[PDB]
Structure formats: structure tokens, C-alpha cells
Symmetry: C2
Subunit: 331 residues, 2 copies
């Protein structure tokens, strides 16, 4: 039974989302629909992405590293084609852990807004030793036009994976072949004190061929799981910051992703159905549904206002329902 | 909330590849017996819903709002950056003010003159401006973090939280150093181990370098039953591409608990299902043998390894089956 996939702890503070690993504190309805494949599992034990259901560091053994000038305090760019992560057993699209987001270019000397940023370095393919003057915060994502005219991409087909430092490195490296190493904990790129929109926005997510979309069904709209994430421009901001709170979203709680990767649920739900749970709040309730592609839905209609989980009391299973029956929204 | 049975704390996935340890977050692939015993408090929970440490059962990031930042050098570029504060000043940590949530329970080893220490906890981060939260973006680097005395100019590792400092010191040069009376620290919470050259070092941390808080109970041997840590492969600074089975040697990191156990113990109180003097015991069934593992009320796991400190690989582990409550003086079966 799918019932055990969503339990009260997952949504009352002990859950984490499958993209940022952030503590899940809100639900984010997406009335346009969206797609996600990386670190996303369906109910047939399968993923269309390139990452395992844990938070792997990011390592690629063969890319091009360069900087744009002298050689100190310079922006370092690493890139490779998609489909070259030949040591990744899930997929060669990209290293396990590489973020499913478009890489955004700079605006003059202004840092891009909304990109996935991790800390990392380039390393020497001769011996595995780091080029230690290349440590920095790097924006990672999919793009065309690397190294020096990057535009974000939303497909894995015929594109590049890029890492570009958002600040200057101590000692730049021009290496026609070099490795990448980045930790898998991400922050979002910003400059100045402001939080940006929830990240990634639907049209920023990168998916691989064959990924099914989560489309709305009447008033039933797909939902993402939201937690507070850090941002580069005010790194001390957190939940309730006077400068605004920054949210990151994932398509699934990682505990759900993990369970779906360990057990096949194809006998318990078929196309056209949801497995439904009731979320009971202090003064209302709503139903959340899971479909066979692993996407969650709520009956929010054309609303993208976040639903805070602060007053959630418990989660109770309801059972299998048609996906065309409106999910109750009684808040 | 109370639970009547610890049985659910250890299940087959925890030890056959879906588990992670509570210090490094690494995939659990082995058991590390510790015949002389050890203590751990950070991100370690007991069966009474409590921790003696300063971290939640979660990995996010390390943030401290008020330390001293400095560098040394004749110039301000490509220099070593040091940040430090006293323990007991992490006032924005709801668990404990000892140290920021996520700060590693390891000693900070001093270094200078283009050598770096072996076996320290290293994380990536920066110092930041307390006026507005903006990074000093030229201070990003890999930093060794730990507890110490003597910062900034005579750093020596400490094993207690009492009267010591928390220190971050970059193992490579930063782009632009900062001498600031007050600066904040921001480091990611998943570490690598400091090394030089290609070699792996011993499993990290060794028992003699774990930092604990006052009141932390020790895991002491009881006859042939000895405490065990959970081992996974971790990165190391000197050969960052090395992973499991590397031709240059495999580097292990250890934690006292699978983080899924820590999390469950933090959510549910088990104090009515196990008492001092008792283990809850599970059987680990391998292709070619089996062993018993026990959990005590302080949250520590034990096996009947006796005087052996050999790692036990979990490659051929088939499943985990609950046995029940037993006296901790009964020898745990070890049939490998």
C-alpha cells in the first residue's frame, strides 16, 4: 500500500525535499504544472534522472577549465557536454547530484539571480589533486554557449553542463582537461539582501527525454515541497528574515523518493488514479494526492499561494480515488 | 510520543546501502568495532529523546554570527584565513549554545608554512559581514573546523567543549584576506577529511579526537561486547577524486549512529522499552555467517567482536532481523 509513503513526520518537521534537502515547511501549488526527473522516482521503481535518492557530492572527471582575466581573483568556468558522466551508473547525462537547473549568465558584473550554487573546485586529472586556488562558490546548471556566452537550457539533449564561479578564485586554471568536484548542498544565487522567487521556478527545471509532465486536472494542480534555503547575497538570512525568506522547492520528500526506489508500487496504483491523504490542520484540512508518475497534487485551482505547514496536526490516509475527483481544499 | 519497541530502529535498508552515518552523512558500508570504547554526543540521541550535543538530526549548514576573522601574510591575497569564537556563544542555536548546529565534534589541528594536517574535518565556506549578511566573497575556501585552544596563533586540538574555542582555518589560500573584529562563519555541514598527497588515513575521527560536552556518557566495553561505529567512504582533500576502492586507498569516516536512527530517537521516546543493563538485539544475516548487534539506552551500538578492531564489510549482508531485549552482559554472537 502507498499509504506509508506520506506520514505525519514527513510534513511536520522531519521531512526534507529531494532537490535542496531543506526542511519541508510549506506546500507550493503550481497551477501551470511542471516536470521533474532528477532524484524523482515513480511508482514503478524508476527514475528518468541521473541522481540516486541520496545527496551525493558532484564529481565529473573530464571537462574544460578556463578563466577570463590577470590570473588572480578571476572567474573560473568549467564545462562539459551532457552525456559524458561515464562513471555514473544511473545515467551518463550528468554526474550523480548535478542540479536539474539552467545555468544563468552574468548581468555585467552582477551575479545571476536564481541559479543553483555549490562550493567546489577543479582538480587535476593526472592524480586527483585539487587545483587549490580554484575553490569558490560555483553556479552549476545546464546551458548552451559555454564557457563565455552561457544561456540556460531546460533539456539534457545536446546541451552542456557548466560550473561558473560567482566570485573570483585565488588562482585561475586554464586546463583543456580538468575534473570538477562540488558538494551537493546548494544555495541560490542572489546579490544584495533580497530573497527571490521560490527556486527553481517551473521553467528553470531541466528534464531528460521521456520525463512525464505533471499537468493540472481541473482544480487539481501539482504541488512541490518547500523549505527555507540559503542565498548567496545575504548568507545569514533564514526563516523569517527581515530581508525576506528564501524558499527552495522539490517535487518529492526525499523519504518518499527513497521508498519508491526500494519498492515497486505498480500493483497499488494505475494511471488515472491518485492515492489520497488527508492533512488535518488546527482549523481546516486539505487532501493531497499522489499519481503513478510520483507527482503530488492538491486542489488549489489557480492559486500559487504557499500553504504553511506550521499548524499541521497529522496526516491520515484516505485511499485510491480518480484523479478527476476534486481534492478537498478546506482551509 | 512513546514507542513500545525499538525493533524498528534497525531494518535491512539501513545497513544494505540506504543508511547514512550521523557524522559524515556517508553511505554506511561497514561496521567499525572500537574495543577500547568511545564517546559521542553531537547528533547522537539516546532512548530518552535527548542529546548531549549541539546539532539536530539533519545536515544543513554551519552558521555562527560573531567570531574574529584574520589572516597572515605580507600581502592580503592568497593568504590563510582564520576564524574563531569561544564555545558557548552560539546563541541562535535552540539545541545548545555550545557551538553552531552542524559544527563538527572533532579537534582542530594547527598548521602553518604550506603543510596541512592529516585527519581534520574540512568543509567549504566563507566568512561574512555582520552588518548586512553579505559574504566577504574573497574568503571562500576549504576550512578545517574543530575545537581547540590557542587560537589564532598556537592552535592545538581540544576534546572538550568546556573553556575551548571553535576554529575555522583555511587549508589553502583565500583570494582576499579579511582582518575583522567581528565576522560571521558559514560552512556547509558535510565534510571531507584533510590529507596531503594521495594516501588515505585511518578511519576518521579516531576515538581519541572526538569532542564531547559535559555529562556525555561513554560507550565502554562489557566483556566481549564492544561498541561499534558505522563506516562509510568519505572524500579526502589530497586526492579529491578517490572513492570506494580507489587504487590510492579507501578513506573511511565513522559515526556513532545511522542518521535514520538518530532521527527516530529524536521524535519518539523509548525510555519504557529498554533499561540500563539491557541491549535491544538484532541479528545480521550474511551470505556466509551472522552476527548480533545490540543497542543500549544511551544510543550506542555494540557487537561481540572482543579485542578485534577489524572492519566488518556489509557487502554480503542479506537482512536484519529483530531478536529482542537481552542483558548487556550476555555475549553477542559473532559467527563470521
Amino acid at each position: 500500500s502507498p499509504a506509508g509513503l506520506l506520514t505525519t513526520p514527513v510534513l511536520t518537521g522531519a521531512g526534507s525535499d529531494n532537490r535542496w534537502g531543506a526542511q519541508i515547511v510549506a506546500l507550493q501549488p503550481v497551477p501551470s504544472g511542471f516536470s521533474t526527473c532528477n532524484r524523482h522516482w515513480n511508482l514503478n521503481g524508476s527514475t528518468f534522472g541521473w541522481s540516486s535518492p541520496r545527496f551525493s557530492d558532484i564529481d565529473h572527471p573530464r571537462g574544460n577549465a578556463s578563466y577570463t582575466g590577470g590570473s588572480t581573483n578571476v572567474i573560473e568556468t568549467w564545462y562539459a557536454n551532457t552525456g559524458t558522466a561515464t562513471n555514473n551508473p544511473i545515467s551518463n547525462i550528468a554526474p550523480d547530484g548535478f542540479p536539474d537547473m539552467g545555468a544563468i549568465g552574468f548581468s555585467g558584473q552582477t551575479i545571476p539571480t536564481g541559479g543553483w550554487v555549490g562550493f567546489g573546485e577543479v582538480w587535476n586529472v593526472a592524480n586527483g589533486s585539487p587545483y587549490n586556488g580554484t575553490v569558490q562558490a560555483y553556479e552549476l546548471g545546464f546551458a548552451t554557449g559555454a564557457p563565455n556566452s552561457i544561456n540556460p537550457a531546460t533539456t539534457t539533449v545536446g546541451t552542456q553542463i557548466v560550473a561558473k564561479s560567482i566570485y573570483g578564485v585565488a588562482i585561475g586554471q586554464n586546463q583543456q582537461t580538468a575534473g570538477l568536484f562540488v558538494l551537493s548542498t546548494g544555495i541560490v544565487s542572489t546579490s544584495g539582501p533580497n530573497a527571490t522567487t521560490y527556486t527553481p521556478q517551473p521553467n528553470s527545471i531541466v528534464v531528460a527525454p521521456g520525463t512525464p509532465a505533471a499537468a493540472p486536472i481541473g482544480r487539481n494542480v501539482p504541488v512541490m515541497f518547500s523549505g527555507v534555503i540559503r542565498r548567496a547575497g545575504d548568507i545569514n538570512a533564514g526563516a523569517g528574515s527581515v530581508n525576506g525568506t528564501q524558499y527552495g522547492v522539490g517535487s518529492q520528500p526525499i523519504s518518499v523518493t527513497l521508498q519508491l526506489s526500494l519498492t515497486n508500487y505498480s500493483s497499488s496504483l494505475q494511471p488515472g488514479q491518485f492515492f489520497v491523504w488527508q492533512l488535518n490542520f488546527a482549523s481546516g484540512f486539505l487532501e493531497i494526492g499522489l499519481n503513478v508518475d510520483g507527482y503530488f497534487y492538491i486542489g488549489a485551482g489557480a492559486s500559487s499561494n504557499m500553504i504553511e505547514l506550521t499548524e499541521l496536526i497529522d496526516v491520515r490516509p484516505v485511499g485510491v480515488r480518480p484523479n478527476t475527483s476534486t481534492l478537498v481544499f478546506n482551509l
